[PDB]
C-alpha cells in the first residue's frame, strides 16, 4: 500500500484489478520546513550602564545601593565587555545569566584598591571586608571589578574616597553603618576624636597613577541575586530569529503561532493594528512586530493525490495528479522527466500533446488523460 501509486490505487480500491480512470488515493501535505519566532523588542530595558560607568562611585563604608526590579536586565552588555578582569561570580554562569530569571537584583557599587579585591568574596576574612562591606556566605550575587587608576586616582593623592580601618567588632553580612563612632581602646579615656589608643575609624588613602597596582583603585560592583520565591519582575530578553519568505515555515509573530507560507503583502495596515483576519475568522496577514511591515500568510499547500491509469490489464503505467498545487513544491514522484501543470493541478508521468481527442480519463479544467501510442 506504499510501494507505488498503482499499488496505492489497488489498496484504496480493495481490488487487485484497477479499471481505466482516475482514482483519488491519498492526501498531499507539505510539512513545515522550520519554526521562526520574531518576538518584539525590549519593553523596559533599565541598564547597568549608569551604575557601572557612573560619574563617581560612593565610599566603600557607605556604598552605592541600587534596587533593580520590574525590568528587563540585559546581562549581555556585561558579558561582552572584556574590561572586567575580576568576574568572580557564583550561582549562575555568565552566558546563562540572561536566561536566568530572578525576583530582585541588588547593586552594591564602590571603589576598592587591588590589594583587597580578593576580600570581596563569600567566606573571606579581612579588615576591609569586616569593616566596610561583607558578603553573605550563601552568596548568589555576581562580583565584577575593573581598573580605574586612570579615572579615580589624581595627582598628589585622592582623598574623596573614605574607608574604615578601625572597629571593635566585625560587620555582619551586608551591613552599612555611617555613624562612624570613635574608636576606643585600652583605658578608653578618649571622649573626643584623639586620645590614648584612640583614632578616627575613618581614613583616606592617597590614590596616585604612579602608585603600585595593588594600591590602585578599582571600580567594583556586586550584583546580589535571590532565588525564585515569588513571581519574577526583572528578567532577560527574548528570541529574535530571522524571517524567511516564500517558504512554508511555522511562524510566531507576537504569539500568533500560525503555520503557512509568508509573502510581502500589498494590503495596508493601520498603525495600531497588528494582524488581519479573513471573512471566515482565519488569520491571513500579520504585521511583523520587530520591523513594521505586513506579511501575507497563506496555508501550506495541500490537496488530493489522484492516480490516472488505464486498465491494469492494458498496462501498469500510471500518472499522478496532485490537485491544486504548483509543481515547484510538489517533490517537497519518481518519473520527474515530464511534469506538466494545469489548472486542475500538477500532473506527473504524462506528456502534453497539442492534438485534442475525445475525453477518456477526465482530469479537470477541460483536460483529459489517455493511454495511447
Amino acid at each position, epitope marked *: 500500500c506504499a510501494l507505488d501509486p498503482l499499488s496505492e490505487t489497488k489498496c484504496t480500491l480493495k481490488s487487485f484489478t484497477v479499471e481505466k480512470g482516475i482514482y483519488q488515493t491519498s492526501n498531499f501535505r507539505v510539512q513545515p520546513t522550520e519554526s521562526i519566532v520574531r518576538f518584539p523588542n525590549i519593553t523596559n530595558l533599565c541598564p547597568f550602564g549608569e551604575v557601572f560607568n557612573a560619574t563617581r562611585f560612593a565610599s566603600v563604608y557607605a556604598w552605592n545601593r541600587k534596587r533593580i526590579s520590574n525590568c528587563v536586565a540585559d546581562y549581555s552588555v556585561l*558579558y561582552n565587555s*572584556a574590561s572586567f*578582569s*575580576t*568576574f568572580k*561570580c557564583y550561582g*549562575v*554562569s555568565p552566558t546563562k545569566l540572561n536566561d536566568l530569571c530572578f525576583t530582585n537584583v541588588y547593586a552594591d557599587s564602590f571603589v576598592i584598591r587591588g590589594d583587597e579585591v580578593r576580600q570581596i568574596a563569600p*567566606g573571606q576574612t579581612g579588615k576591609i571586608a569586616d569593616y566596610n562591606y561583607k558578603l553573605p556566605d*550563601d552568596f548568589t550575587g555576581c562580583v565584577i571589578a575593573w581598573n580605574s587608576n586612570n579615572l579615580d586616582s589624581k595627582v598628589g593623592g585622592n582623598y574623596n574616597y573614605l574607608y574604615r580601618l578601625f572597629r571593635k567588632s566585625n560587620l555582619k553580612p551586608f551591613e552599612r553603618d555611617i555613624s562612624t563612632e570613635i574608636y576606643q581602646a585600652g583605658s578608653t579615656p578618649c571622649n573626643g576624636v584623639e586620645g590614648f589608643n584612640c583614632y578616627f575609624p575613618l581614613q583616606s588613602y592617597g590614590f596616585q597613577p604612579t602608585n603600585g597596582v595593588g594600591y590602585q583603585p578599582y571600580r567594583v560592583v556586586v550584583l546580589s541575586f535571590e532565588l525564585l520565591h515569588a513571581p519574577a519582575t526583572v528578567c532577560g530578553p527574548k528570541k529574535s530569529t530571522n524571517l524567511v519568505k516564500n517558504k512554508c515555515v511555522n511562524f510566531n509573530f507576537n504569539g500568533l503561532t500560525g503555520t503557512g507560507v509568508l509573502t510581502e503583502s500589498n494590503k495596508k495596515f493601520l498603525p495600531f493594528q497588528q494582524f488581519g483576519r479573513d471573512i471566515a475568522d482565519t488569520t491571513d496577514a500579520v504585521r511583523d512586530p520587530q520591523t513594521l511591515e505586513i506579511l501575507d500568510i497563506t496555508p501550506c499547500s495541500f490537496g488530493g493525490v489522484s492516480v490516472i491509469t488505464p486498465g491494469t490489464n492494458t498496462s501498469n503505467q500510471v500518472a499522478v495528479l496532485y490537485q491544486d498545487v504548483n509543481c515547484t513544491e510538489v517533490p517537497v514522484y519518481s518519473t520527474g522527466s515530464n511534469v506538466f501543470q494545469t489548472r486542475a493541478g500538477c500532473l506527473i508521468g504524462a506528456e502534453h500533446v497539442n492534438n485534442s481527442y475525445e475525453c477518456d480519463i477526465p482530469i479537470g479544467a477541460g483536460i483529459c488523460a489517455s493511454y495511447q501510442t
Partner: antibody
C-alpha cells in the same frame, strides 16, 4: 596545612566506592571549596566535582560524572565522595585539593590515593 | 561545562630557552585560570593563578598572559628540573562552568 585521603584501593567492577578527604590545621570555611580531581595512570587531570564550604550546600558536578558521583560535606574537617557503577576506565589517582573562594588556583594538594577497578 | 584545549601535546626546548603553551576555552572565562606543573610521582603544584598572578615561592621565569578565550603560558631560562607536565584549568567553583583540565603538555629538556 595538609590534606589526606582514605578509603581507596581495590574495588570490584560494578560496585560502589566511598572516598574521604580529611584536613589538618584548618576548617572547611565558606571561603574555601572542596574539589575532587582524577588522573589516569598515563593521562592528564580530569575534574570531578566541588562543594562549597561553610553553611552553604551549593555543589557543582562535572558533565561526565553528573549522575555517577555524590559529593557532600559530612563535617567541617572531613568530606566524602561516592562513585557508582565503576568501570575499568575509572582506574585513576584521586587528588583532594582546596580552592579559595577568591577563584584563585588550587593550593595545598593532597598526596593522592590510587583506586583500581579490577577483579 | 567549559572544556580546555591545550596545545602542543609534546614540546622540546634546549636549556635556557623559552617554551610557550596555549590554552583555549569554549566560552569566555574572564581570567579565572590556573597553570600547574606536575612532576612524575608528585601531586600537581600551583604556578600561576588569575592568568597573571604568581604565588609565593614561584620564580619570575614563569609568566602568564592573555584574556578572553585565549591564554598563554611562557617559561624562560629552562632548567633541568623544569621537565614536567603543564596543565591549564578554569577556576569556576560554583559557576556551572566547571573546572575541567586540558590536555597535559610534557616538556623535554
Amino acid at each position: 596545612e595538609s590534606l589526606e585521603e582514605s578509603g581507596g584501593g581495590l574495588v570490584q567492577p560494578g560496585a560502589s566506592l566511598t572516598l574521604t578527604c580529611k584536613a589538618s590545621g584548618f576548617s572547611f570555611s565558606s571561603g574555601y571549596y572542596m574539589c575532587w580531581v582524577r588522573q589516569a595512570p598515563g593521562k592528564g587531570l580530569e575534574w570531578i566535582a566541588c562543594t562549597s564550604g561553610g553553611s552553604s550546600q551549593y555543589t557543582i558536578y562535572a558533565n561526565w560524572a553528573k549522575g555517577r558521583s555524590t559529593i557532600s560535606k559530612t563535617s567541617s574537617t572531613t568530606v566524602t565522595l561516592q562513585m557508582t557503577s565503576l568501570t575499568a576506565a575509572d582506574t585513576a589517582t584521586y587528588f583532594c585539593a582546596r580552592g579559595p573562594s577568591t577563584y584563585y588556583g588550587m593550593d595545598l594538594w593532597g598526596p593522592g590515593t590510587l583506586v583500581t577497578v579490577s577483579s | 561545562d567549559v572544556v580546555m584545549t591545550q596545545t602542543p601535546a609534546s614540546v622540546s626546548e634546549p636549556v635556557g630557552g623559552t617554551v610557550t603553551t596555549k590554552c583555549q576555552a569554549s566560552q569566555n572565562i574572564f581570567n579565572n585560570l590556573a597553570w600547574y606543573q606536575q612532576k612524575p610521582g608528585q601531586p600537581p603544584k600551583l604556578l600561576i593563578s588569575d592568568a597573571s598572578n604568581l604565588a609565593s615561592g614561584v620564580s619570575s621565569r614563569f609568566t602568564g598572559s592573555g584574556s578572553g578565550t585565549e591564554y598563554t603560558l611562557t617559561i624562560g631560562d629552562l632548567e633541568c628540573a623544569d621537565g614536567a607536565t603543564y596543565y591549564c584549568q578554569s577556576t569556576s567553583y560554583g559557576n556551572d562552568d566547571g573546572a575541567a583540565f586540558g590536555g597535559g603538555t610534557e616538556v623535554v629538556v
